[PDB]
Design a protein around this ligand. Structure first.
Ligand code: ZN
Lengths: 50, 130, 77, 101, 151, 49
RNA sequence: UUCAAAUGAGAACUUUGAAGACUGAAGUGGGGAAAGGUUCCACGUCAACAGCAGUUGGACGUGGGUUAGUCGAUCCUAAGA
RNA sequence: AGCUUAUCACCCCGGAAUUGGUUUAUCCGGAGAUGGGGUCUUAUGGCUGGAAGAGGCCAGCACCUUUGCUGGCUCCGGUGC
RNA sequence: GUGAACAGCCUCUAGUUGAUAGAAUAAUGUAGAUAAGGGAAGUCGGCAAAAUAGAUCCGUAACUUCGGGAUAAGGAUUGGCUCUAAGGGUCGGCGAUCAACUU
């Protein structure tokens, strides 16, 4: 999984060109963080309300 | 490519450290090459000949600057141990082991400190004359 | 643009009869390095120049505001 | 001395974060005059449950605190959803990003 | 559609080049409706157009190499490629040295460690050489004063 | 240029006001021989000195 | 040079985004003089032109746009007329 | 814009060999040096006014707006053939 | 940034990604590159190519209008890492303190 993380970040980064966008300004879906936090082992009953 | 091809030609071939070992081994060999009568063709007219780096310099000061250098120390640090003959090459493969081991203990006992003392006499001779 | 030290000349300027407008500015400043305090800048708009008075002590500043003439328009902040 | 104050209400309420693990990370990974294990009378990390608090007589800065907190969030896989921000001077807090449905 | 004018205007508003500014491809009609810098500003603040922070140029390697140079590395004959003069002029060296020697003698004369006549001969001797540095000048001064009081 | 004289600018203004196609209500006229503007000008094709 | 989407009857060539590269401060940058003269900008827009293509264009059709007591000319004289 | 600030230059005192002062570069001095005090040009810099109210960096909050409004920070330094 | 350097190489800001495309990889060409042993037997002719090349040190002939020739020629070296020494300024009646790259 460490090697998989490295391989993912290799594609994700591309840093010598264009300065990865900040997350302050972007917006993400709901469902994505559902999957992420379920995989991490949390539950989303406090977020579904919201 | 060009560098290896044009440096390591058999025309420009140098003098095979085995033989430099066999030469620095004994007294008469080193004194002969320190004496080296006047030859019109040799670079330094004979004299000023380094034996480790089998090379004729022009002058005493060119010998000094050669000895105060890493090109000399490369060779002296290469020539300390045994000289890697075909005996070693075949003893590694399982062939004439006892000959190799006799040669090894012979160098360790007899020939090693012989050559070391010869090198030390050479060094203080050169440092005193230069 | 010009600074003033005296008070009498600021009053004369307020009563110069070519002044229509003034303005008070409040700044928060630190003294030496040390303590917050309230600087006040009384600016008056002449025809050619803008005259200004720097008052560090608010007590004297508000008494200056009182002694200002009444017809003169003033602008706060 | 110098005091710094982090708030952790937002993630802790929705159940992604535990301040005790965050303080357990800080109290060991904070460096003084070199490496870990020199917080002798100089630094005090203490939690309440909603607010973590640091008090330091030694060299310590809000950028260092942010660096440590972002490292912890990357450890627990929270960098891509939470940000450490300043609300007032030396008063910081964790906040979710602008995720909308 | 064609958001060329919008990219240009967003660059001119934000104060960067077009290579930075970013248009979310989902809000295409909302961006194409815009034909004014006020509208572009609205789209800047609402989060439809952002700034794309700077492409980095780090100096960790340069600072490390400079630190090794301070420590006395990467300076040998294989790294030297210009003459000693081009690297450091002897005129500059002599200027430093002579200013130093003049300043020292001035301070000694003003303090009273030395008289104006010995100052005068030392000035011209240091204008010439035979005083290689502060140490040699101080030692010569000490020898002079010692033989003087000996006389 | 950009520091023109008024003579040059006046000639330029005449050229701008001339730089048009032909109106359509002239096609519809009794005994109309004209079908295009043969004295039309473009900055890249011909120069007007 | 490439990938997806959008537009469109139609996309190797247009737009956006995602990548990879280039000019590398004696620039493929930012401004000016001479010359040019609206080529600037917008809206529509493809018959002809852009030695392939074209939904694009310095093209085609219609409009908008150049604000000075302080920048310049204007004034002075130079070689000269 | 106000106050202050300089190399050269100049003024008063005084009268110099045991010749002294001095530039990286050797010139200056009884036609008055060194030294002590002072005067001037104010290019140039420093403080203040202009001026933080501007601009910049962040944080928000309306979310129904084709302009919606608040809060914080904007400090102190260092170095060179 | 390297480096003596506005050289050459890479990069930041800003800008561009324009020059008809696709599939194969025959000869002959255009632009380059390598080659055993021999080394100018080639050719009108060493054309062209190769070799040399920067910096430190040693050393440098005839001739000379005494100014040069001269980088004559010909030789020893060059990395990295850890160290030593020397080279300065400001204050205190030798010390405290600060700082740069040159050997
Ligand atoms: Zn040798």
């Amino acid at each position: 999984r460490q090697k998989t993380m490295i391989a993912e970040a290799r594609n994700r980064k591309s840093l010598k060109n264009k300065a990865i966008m900040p997350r302050s300004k972007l917006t993400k879906s709901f469902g994505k963080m559902e999957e992420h936090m379920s995989t991490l082992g949390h539950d989303m009953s406090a977020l579904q309300d919201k | 490519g060009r560098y290896s091809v044009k440096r390591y030609k058999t025309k420009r071939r140098t003098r095979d450290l085995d033989l430099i070992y066999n030469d620095l081994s004994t007294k008469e060999s080193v004194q002969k090459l320190l004496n080296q009568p006047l030859d019109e063709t040799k670079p330094g007219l004979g004299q000023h000949y380094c034996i480790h780096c089998a090379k004729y310099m022009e002058t005493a000061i060119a010998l000094k600057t050669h000895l105060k250098g890493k090109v000399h120390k490369r060779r002296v640090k290469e020539l300390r141990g045994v000289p890697y003959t075909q005996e070693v090459s075949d003893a590694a493969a399982g062939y004439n082991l006892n000959k190799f081991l006799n040669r090894v203990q012979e160098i360790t006992q007899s020939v090693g400190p012989e050559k070391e003392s010869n090198e030390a006499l050479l060094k203080e001779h050169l440092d005193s004359t230069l | 643009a010009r600074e003033i030290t005296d008070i009498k000349q600021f009053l004369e300027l307020t009563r110069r009869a070519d002044v229509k407008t003034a303005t008070v500015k409040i700044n928060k400043k630190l003294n030496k390095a040390g303590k917050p305090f309230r600087q006040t800048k009384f600016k008056v708009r002449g025809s050619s120049s803008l005259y200004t008075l720097v008052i560090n002590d608010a007590g004297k500043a508000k008494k200056l505001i009182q002694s200002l003439p009444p017809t003169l328009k003033v602008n706060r902040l | 001395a110098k005091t710094f104050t982090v708030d952790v209400s937002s993630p802790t309420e929705n159940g992604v974060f535990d301040p005790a693990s965050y303080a357990k990370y800080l109290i060991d990974h904070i460096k003084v005059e070199g490496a870990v294990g020199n917080l002798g009378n100089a630094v005090t990390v203490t939690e309440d449950g909603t607010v973590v608090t640091v008090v330091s007589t030694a060299k310590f800065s809000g950028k260092y605190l942010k660096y440590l907190t972002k490292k912890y969030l990357k450890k627990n896989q929270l960098r891509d959803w939470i940000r450490f921000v300043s609300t007032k001077t030396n008063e910081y807090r964790l906040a979710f990003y602008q995720v909308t449905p | 559609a064609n958001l060329r004018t919008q990219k240009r205007l967003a660059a001119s508003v934000v104060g960067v080049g077009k290579r930075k500014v970013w248009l979310d491809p989902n809000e295409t009609s909302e961006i194409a409706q815009a034909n004014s810098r006020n509208a572009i500003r609205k789209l800047v603040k609402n989060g439809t157009i952002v700034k794309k922070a700077v492409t980095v140029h780090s100096k960790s390697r340069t600072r490390a190499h400079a630190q090794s140079k301070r420590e006395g590395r990467h300076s040998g004959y294989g790294k030297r490629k210009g003459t000693r003069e081009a690297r450091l002029p002897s005129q500059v060296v002599w200027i430093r040295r002579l200013r130093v020697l003049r300043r020292l003698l001035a301070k000694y004369r003003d303090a009273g460690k030395i008289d104006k006549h010995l100052y005068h001969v030392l000035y011209k001797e240091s204008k010439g050489n035979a005083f290689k540095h502060k140490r040699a000048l101080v030692e010569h001064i000490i020898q002079a004063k010692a033989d003087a009081q000996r006389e | 240029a950009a520091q023109k004289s008024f003579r040059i600018k006046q000639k330029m203004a005449k050229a701008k006001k001339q730089n048009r196609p032909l109106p359509q209500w002239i096609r519809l006229r009794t005994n109309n021989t004209i079908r295009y503007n043969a004295k039309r000008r473009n900055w890249r094709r011909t120069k007007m000195n």
